[PDB]
Write a protein that binds this ligand. Sequence first.
Ligand code: ZN
Lengths: 232, 57, 121, 59
Amino acid sequence: RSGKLPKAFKIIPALSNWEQILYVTEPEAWTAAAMYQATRIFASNLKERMAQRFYNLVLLPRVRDDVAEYKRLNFHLYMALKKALFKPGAWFKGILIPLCESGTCTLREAIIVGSIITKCSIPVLHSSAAMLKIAEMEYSGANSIFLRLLLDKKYALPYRVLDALVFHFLGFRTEKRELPVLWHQCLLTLVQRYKADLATDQKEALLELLRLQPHPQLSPEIRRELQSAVPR
Amino acid sequence: PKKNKHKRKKVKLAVLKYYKVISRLRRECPSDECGAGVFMASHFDRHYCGKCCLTYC
Amino acid sequence: FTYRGVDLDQLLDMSYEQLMQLYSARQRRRLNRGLRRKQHSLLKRLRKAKKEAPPMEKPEVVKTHLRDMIILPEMVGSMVGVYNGKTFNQVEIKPEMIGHYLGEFSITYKPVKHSRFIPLK
Amino acid sequence: SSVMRRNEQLTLHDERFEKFYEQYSNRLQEVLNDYYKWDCESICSTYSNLYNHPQLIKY
RNA sequence: AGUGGAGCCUGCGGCUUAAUUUGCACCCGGCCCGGACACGGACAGGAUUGACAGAUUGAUAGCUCUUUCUCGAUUCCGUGGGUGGUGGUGCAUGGCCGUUGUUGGCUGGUUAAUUCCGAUGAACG
Ligand SMILES: [Zn+2]
């Protein structure tokens, strides 16, 4: 619940055989505050790779079955997951992207950890790498929130990243599946933030993308954002 | 009774205390992970290493 | 002073196991059930506070919530301020305070301290 | 990758992405040893109304 | 037969009280964390992260008060009657349950015991 933690638990960052130590500690059976302190000490004095391994093995199933059980996130696990965001690269490669290729991510998980993304200023380079990687893999109902909020981060976008994004949207050219309102919201955020970095061919390509896949509510906004855009 | 958050003391030129002019003004921790620059905090009764929690008294 | 015919000096010399034979039935039952970690902690704290006290006047104040603490004969002369829920009350430990709990000496409630019509027409 | 590209306007940054997509003891003994009356209405009763009267001009 | 009389107990009022919760909810103290957007500040001269020891404290604690060691952009200060999101809530909305027959088919320790735990399928209407 609370109090000082024992000194035999703060030595696991300095202990080589961490796997058997965490295995003997009954991996299905801590509480949330123990996760908060453990993630604090495994993101504070620990290096990148084994912290990523900790994120892959322990933190992701814990947050997943917690939000599967209570349909929300506990306070202490939320604080732990933010303290995992204190190390950007390990948390992206250990929680975020494994949840992306998990394929079973729901809207609640995506919106919660995307809000966690929103509340912290992440580095531009490695986030742009994450942009490219989330652009390469397939579209579900969860990664769209990540696209929308990460474009709402409003960082200096690299142009290989923008090429990957427009390549993805050209990948959504001739599909007949009913795109959500949030898809048009993502497109609106992109054409609101990075309309200046789009060349004329990108503008017209998004124009027939608007033509073949229209929206009675949000497509005129994308139309007027494309038509009132000043290039570089 | 509001709990104010702790603020780190912005000390002026924290680098400029371990060197002269050459040598190391503070001790070096002899551990495996720490060394060749990990200077050694010299409190009025002890010495501490700020990375892997070495303790000398 | 004397307590059950026994003076304070050999009371301090008196052992823990047969100290119960002069105490009351509730007292003896509690000492049979043994003092827990908080009580031993406050015993050590009181002994420490009596340790560096200057040898002419009484030691400093030790404050606690332990209302279910019993006064033991070693505590005689300590300055203890026990909680009543809102504030701390400081009390002497007198030799004749031996059979009573600490919580008796800080009362948790304040006492209760609590034009006819005549027709003119 | 793609086929339609920048063609203009000042590529600043070089997009180092190769480390991302292709990525995927006496101390223990010594810490083991270390382990082991008035209110706002009634006050109006004490106010006087007969001290600082201005001069009255009669008719 | 009583109650209304008396003592005690209890329920509503009222009085005291920090609270005497209400048609553990109450009180006294100590932790934890509390948006982005816009603009103006500090920031590699270094923003910020972790920390031993001692203490404050009813108690201990880098979650606090001293003493400098380390991590380095993973940043942190202020003002908005501007939105708001781990919010609460209703409607249309796609999938999925339950709802309105018939015949077959043992490594281990443990107990009085084929005892206990422990590993471990088919058709017909
Ligand atoms: Zn070191």
